[PDB]
Amino acid sequence: ETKCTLKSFTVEKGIYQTSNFRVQPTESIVRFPNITNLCPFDEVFNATRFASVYAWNRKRISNCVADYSVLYNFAPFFAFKCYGVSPTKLNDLCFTNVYADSFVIRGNEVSQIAPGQTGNIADYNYKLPDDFTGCVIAWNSNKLDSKVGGNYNYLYRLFRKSNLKPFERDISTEIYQAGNKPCNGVAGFNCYFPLRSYGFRPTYGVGHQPYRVVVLSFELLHAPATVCGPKKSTNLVKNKCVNFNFNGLTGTGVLTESNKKFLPFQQFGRDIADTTDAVRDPQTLEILDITPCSFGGVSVITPGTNTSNQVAVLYQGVNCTEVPVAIHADQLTPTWRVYSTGSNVFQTRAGCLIGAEYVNNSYECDIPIGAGICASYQTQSQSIIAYTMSLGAENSVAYSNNSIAIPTNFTISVTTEILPVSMTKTSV
Amino acid sequence: DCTMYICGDSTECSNLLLQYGSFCTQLKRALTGIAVEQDKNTQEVFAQVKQIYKTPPIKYFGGFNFSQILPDPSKPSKRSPIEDLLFNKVTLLICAQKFNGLTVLPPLLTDEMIAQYTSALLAGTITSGWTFGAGPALQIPFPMQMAYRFNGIGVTQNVLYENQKLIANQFNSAIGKIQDSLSSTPSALGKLQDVVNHNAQALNTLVKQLSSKFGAISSVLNDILSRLDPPEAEVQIDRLITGRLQSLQTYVTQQLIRAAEIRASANLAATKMSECVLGQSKRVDFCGKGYHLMSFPQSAPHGVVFLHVTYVPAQEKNFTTA
Amino acid sequence: SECVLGQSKRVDFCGKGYHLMSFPQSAPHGVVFLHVTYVPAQEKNFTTAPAICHDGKAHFPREGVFVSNGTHWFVTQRNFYEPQIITTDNTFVSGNCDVVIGIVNNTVYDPLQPELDSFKE
Amino acid sequence: DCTMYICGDSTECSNLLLQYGSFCTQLKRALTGIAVEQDKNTQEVFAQV
Ligand SMILES: *[C@@H]1O[C@H](CO)[C@@H](O[C@@H]2O[C@H](CO)[C@@H](O)[C@H](O)[C@H]2NC(C)=O)[C@H](O)[C@H]1NC(C)=O
Ligand SMILES: *[C@@H]1O[C@H](CO)[C@@H](O[C@@H]2O[C@H](CO)[C@@H](O)[C@H](O)[C@H]2NC(C)=O)[C@H](O)[C@H]1NC(C)=O
Ligand SMILES: *[C@@H]1O[C@H](CO)[C@@H](O[C@@H]2O[C@H](CO)[C@@H](O)[C@H](O)[C@H]2NC(C)=O)[C@H](O)[C@H]1NC(C)=O
Ligand SMILES: *[C@@H]1O[C@H](CO)[C@@H](O[C@@H]2O[C@H](CO)[C@@H](O)[C@H](O)[C@H]2NC(C)=O)[C@H](O)[C@H]1NC(C)=O
Ligand SMILES: *[C@@H]1O[C@H](CO)[C@@H](O[C@@H]2O[C@H](CO)[C@@H](O)[C@H](O)[C@H]2NC(C)=O)[C@H](O)[C@H]1NC(C)=O
Ligand SMILES: *[C@@H]1O[C@H](CO)[C@@H](O[C@@H]2O[C@H](CO)[C@@H](O)[C@H](O)[C@H]2NC(C)=O)[C@H](O)[C@H]1NC(C)=O
Ligand SMILES: *[C@@H]1O[C@H](CO)[C@@H](O)[C@H](O)[C@H]1NC(C)=O
Ligand SMILES: *[C@@H]1O[C@H](CO)[C@@H](O)[C@H](O)[C@H]1NC(C)=O
Ligand SMILES: *[C@@H]1O[C@H](CO)[C@@H](O)[C@H](O)[C@H]1NC(C)=O
Ligand SMILES: *[C@@H]1O[C@H](CO)[C@@H](O)[C@H](O)[C@H]1NC(C)=O
Ligand SMILES: *[C@@H]1O[C@H](CO)[C@@H](O)[C@H](O)[C@H]1NC(C)=O
Ligand SMILES: *[C@@H]1O[C@H](CO)[C@@H](O)[C@H](O)[C@H]1NC(C)=O
Ligand SMILES: *[C@@H]1O[C@H](CO)[C@@H](O)[C@H](O)[C@H]1NC(C)=O
């Protein structure tokens, strides 16, 4: 691994930071609410009559298991466009409530049902919020919403004082003041009836034929969820590294009993950097605390590959007891586990050192390990030893108050000193 | 660690990260160079002694009292009272929050291993003088050494031999106020505390900057992967990878400048140790205010403290000259 | 500027020891200094005194230090052993005999007295 | 000033700027440190009396 990291077939004496070890998870668990009754997705899509645009109705869906793959057979639509979520995994998420709206418009204005759009129908009739998170479905209904004589049951507002706020409905029928004349009368010039009727007939081509529209609105926030997809819960395991799925929010780590005082309207717990730290179990009202797996840097102490072929391994910042826990079959991110805990395990304040033996000697520092510990390839027939660095040789000085030492000879010494002055000049 | 900071042990994020090139092989080398340089910095200031000298058990140096600076054998760690006062004044939840791959390595030289060097220097300088800077230690009585130091600044040596008791009392009283001045003023060790304060807020900002969205659906890769299909997941997480790389690069860019700022001061401290401590300096205002006589070193967390002993003229009278 | 074009008094700036000379050489992208220094050698220890009291007056060295080989007192330079007879020109007198701690008795040669009393007789 | 340099007193640009993190709290501190250092530089050369 050291050779692969250095991109060379030879290595020199030193200590190299190769990689990071991590403990792999054992199994996976799923925790979803225990809900059985199906959702009423037939009334929304299969109805004999649809409300007009100016009086669009809203239906609440909650406390049921929602399968979104069945509504494909309920209406002959083609697009099924969604904004805040991919339609592929709508079955893998848990929502807190669903809202279904339905109406009938002209084919021209179907493009106006979108966030940030304005027009005749997105200003005075139905305006989506700028941060919409849901789906819009529209399909042609010319064969059952347009008569040869003409259809007049569909109304829409064209005149009003000001643009209406998102998800707000206005059903007032009063004469608009469109002139200096006081519009007190029932009707007249400069006084317009704000509601106009469609003319759906088979004669009109595409773009003028009636279209039937259903809008599904979700909200993906942290709150007690009622409507959920069709997934089966498993048992609850504790104190072991597993893959948990609490109401659709996946993760990885160990779960422990927690002593955090939550509140009935609080379900999740966060911290700085905005990551989940505590969860409330959906099936049973219990609080669990998530802790990540065990990880640690690993370093390889080696003499020059020319000199020998033995290495020692330093696990940085871990106590020597968890290394056997870390060293398990099919449970460690590094593939190699040949070292494991095979003797010569020594606890340094820098970390746990494996493959090197400790001696009661003191030499100069060859390969610095840290915290006053060094290592070197030496004899006790040749192995790798780990010792404590020596600052020098002990030497007591002599002091007396009536004695002085004077030299009687001299020496001339010539030394050398090297200093860089400049580098290369480059151009790009 | 890039792979665990940028990507929270995900696999798709890892594949994109390898697709982005070698921006993190370069990051892993600058920090290693900085760490090796930091280990080398302390080896020049202190490791200037061939051996480890020891002061004699009998301590009578002509009336001068050095008990405030020699090691205390009673305490578990052989540190002088000045050194203990210095250590008890610089202080080194969020630390355990660095589950994001940010760690701190221990220095190679232990605090005891630096106290030993300082004690060796002090024993050599108060037993032998400046002679041990050139070759082996050459013994000389402390009053005669002080007479030579007086003679080196233009004052005759009989002044010391005639005012020895007064000079000893003045030195003892002057050295007895360092503890009071340090323990009274709260901003005494401010240059050393700023070093440890500036290296914690950087890590705190690096951790806190993981919650930003950088113009995406959310700041969590798991939610993005669970709500959006791979064709758009690789577009959403691609806006987080670049932002996190840009956040990571500024950290090492500023550390590369702080390291040079620290290295300049380390070089200055090494020069001061060579010149003020291992000899007598004629440079003006280099080793204190006045005429330099002596200097004594002490160790503090992430730094050194010099005690400069200088000669200051006193009561003046004016005459007529020719 | 400092080591090569002159003699440096700064400690450990131009080598280990007492600086004498320096010579420059050029290397690819850098410079090399050869520092020539003076290092003391074989040491021997004597008994020392701060002052000498001859006529009830204290005598201090002019340039050097008082030293003793066991029975006789000499004055020598600090950095080399070169004993000499204590005369009235190696020393200067300042003060009386009872202010200095560690004073010793001895005699100081007077070069003038025999030369100008034998002839003047 | 970031908020006025990057965004010409617009409101949407400001919203994206707050969304983009705290890269301008760090910019406002380095320049302040440089300015204080500049003020300290001239106080050592001259104020020696
Ligand atoms: C490594 O782990 C062992 C096992 O827990 C530690 O030994 C115990 O440590 C705790 C506190 O960490 C003490 O309260 C116990 O008294 C220790 N038991 C024994 C039998 O010593 C050990 O201390 C850990 N190593 C380090 C450096 O903390
Ligand atoms: C030289 O030897 C020692 C210094 O190492 C000193 O002797 C001590 O002197 C003090 C005060 O003069 C006395 O209180 C001690 O009782 C002495 N101790 C011993 C063991 O003699 C002094 O500097 C010199 N000694 C003499 C006798 O002058
Ligand atoms: C000072 O040291 C020098 C050597 O550095 C001594 O010179 C040596 O003396 C021995 C014995 O006479 C000879 O065998 C060597 O050949 C000499 N060396 C050289 C380079 O000439 C010298 O004797 C010493 N001086 C004193 C007074 O001891
Ligand atoms: C050298 O100084 C120390 C520190 O002032 C002296 O130790 C003090 O001695 C007095 C009198 O015995 C005690 O009341 C203090 O409590 C001591 N202080 C400490 C910190 O221990 C010491 O006596 C001085 N040396 C001599 C020879 O007088
Ligand atoms: C200390 O030095 C004196 C220098 O005078 C030595 O005295 C001389 O010693 C030589 C050799 O024995 C004699 O030939 C001279 O006559 C002595 N001079 C006088 C004036 O008596 C003295 O021997 C030396 N001491 C020791 C212990 O070597
Ligand atoms: C030699 O030194 C001794 C002491 O070291 C001196 O002796 C003192 O002499 C004075 C005056 O004669 C007396 O009052 C003292 O009582 C003496 N003290 C001792 C301890 O003897 C002496 O003066 C010095 N000079 C000579 C020539 O002997
Ligand atoms: C719609 O409902 C009617 C009456 O309940 C039923 O006959 C028809 O099969 C339904 N169509 C679909 C597609 O569910
Ligand atoms: C009714 O709602 C609209 C929606 O924007 C708002 O502008 C208006 O002030 C509200 N009240 C009246 C009386 O129109
Ligand atoms: C079903 O869910 C409720 C939610 O409170 C829980 O109390 C109950 O124990 C669950 N039933 C089973 C069989 O787990
Ligand atoms: C290994 O070392 C020997 C002696 O030090 C040397 O002769 C040889 O060329 C080296 N080989 C390599 C591949 O470094
Ligand atoms: C080495 O030191 C340990 C710890 O003091 C001691 O138990 C052991 O006997 C020593 N061994 C040798 C060979 O000195
Ligand atoms: C000394 O200075 C004072 C004022 O500074 C002056 O009055 C006095 O005359 C001076 N002494 C002599 C001898 O000039
Ligand atoms: C010189 O030192 C040695 C030991 O270092 C000692 O035995 C000897 O007595 C000393 N010489 C004198 C004259 O005191």
Residue numbers in the entry:
A (entry chain C): 298 to 677, 689 to 736
B (entry chain A): 737 to 828, 849 to 1078
C (entry chain C): 1030 to 1150
D (entry chain B): 737 to 785
Quoted from the paper:
We determined the cryo-electron microscopy (cryo-EM) structures of these S-trimers at overall resolutions of 3.1–3.5 Å.
Compared with the RBD of BA.1, BA.2 contains three additional mutations, T376A, D405N and R408S, and lacks the BA.1 mutations G446S and G496S. All the S-trimers contain Gly-Ser-Ala-Ser (GSAS) and 6P mutations along with the T4 fibritin trimerization domain for increased stability. By contrast, BA.1, BA.3 and BA.4/BA.5 spike possess relatively tight inter-subunit organization with more buried areas between S2 subunits. In line with structural observations, thermal stability assays also verified that S-trimers from BA.2 sublineages were the least stable among these variants, which might confer an enhanced fusion efficiency. Additionally, the BA.2 subvariants displayed slightly higher binding affinities for hACE2 than the other Omicron variants. Despite this discrepancy, we conclude that BA.2 subvariants and BA.4/BA.5 are able to maintain high binding affinities for hACE2.
